[PDB]
Write a protein that binds this ligand. Structure first.
Ligand SMILES: [Mg+2]
Length: 274
């Protein structure tokens, strides 16, 4: 046999970084990280704040990679305070100790996932940078050690169902469907009373759920007013979540959505979210 060398993935690298923060020691394995960050300030403003969402089994860590672009200040003890609309609970802030001009640094916010009503995955967080400002001379580097506390309002951060699911390919959706079986199979019919094409309905569902459309089911053929969308993912904690939507277009769209998993909670989440 030929022996390959292991190359670390993006997820393995984040896992290593996060396992090195003492506050995150008991979170269990990293489940997923958002494939691209979100900017929480407008372009060409004082700060660049790039947020990556890291999902664990029962928690989420929000990583903020932060740049102070102003040459007449250094920021210290920087966090991004987060206030949720729903029952996510902030547990810990890990600050960036120092943000000198044009030297990026990372802070984190740790939150628990909703316990009492675990289907409540949608949440909006009001975000505010909190920090100490120390004036410094742009040319001399000289810093005034008498700092003061300040804050800076950021854009809201949205968390959705797509943050709790990792997309996964299934080449044979029906085999996967059968393998999971029907112990927690649930179906709900939804009326999409504003939507007048199958293409819009399918595109919207695929984007919202953040699951993988199997067997080219994200492509609607011409001459058809019926269609079946087949979606696959893995829910946090490692169990597959599979969704079938049977859509019918008559003036507008109606659909029968069925979900299967070995775990009841993701099925409930899909149906509540859609
Ligand atoms: Mg200034």
């Amino acid at each position: 046999m030929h022996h390959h060398h292991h190359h670390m993935t993006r997820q393995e690298i984040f896992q290593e970084q996060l396992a090195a923060v003492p506050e995150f020691r008991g979170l269990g394995p990293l489940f997923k990280s958002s494939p691209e960050p979100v900017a929480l300030t407008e372009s060409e403003t004082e700060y660049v704040i790039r947020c990556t969402k890291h999902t664990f089994t029962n928690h989420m860590v929000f990583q903020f990679d932060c740049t102070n672009t102003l040459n007449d200040q250094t920021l210290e003890n920087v966090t991004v305070q987060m206030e949720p609309t729903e029952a996510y609970e902030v547990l810990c802030y890990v600050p960036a100790r120092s943000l000198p001009y044009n030297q990026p640094g990372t802070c984190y916010t740790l939150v628990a996932l909703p316990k009492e009503d675990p289907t409540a995955v949608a949440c909006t967080f009001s975000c505010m940078m909190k920090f100490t400002v120390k004036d410094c001379d742009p040319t001399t580097g000289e810093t005034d050690d008498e700092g003061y506390e300040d804050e800076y309002v950021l854009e809201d951060l949205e968390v959705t169902v797509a943050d709790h699911i990792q997309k996964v390919m299934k080449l044979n959706f029906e085999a996967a469907w059968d393998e999971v079986g029907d112990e927690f199979e649930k179906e709900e019919t939804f009326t999409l009373s504003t939507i007048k094409t199958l293409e819009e309905a399918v595109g919207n569902i695929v984007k919202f759920l953040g699951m993988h459309p199997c067997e080219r089911s994200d492509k609607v053929p011409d001459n058809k007013n019926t269609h079946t969308l087949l979606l696959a993912g893995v829910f946090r904690g490692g169990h597959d979540i599979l969704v079938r939507s049977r859509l019918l277009l008559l003036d507008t769209v109606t659909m029968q959505v069925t979900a299967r998993s070995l775990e009841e909670l993701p099925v409930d989440i899909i149906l509540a979210s859609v």
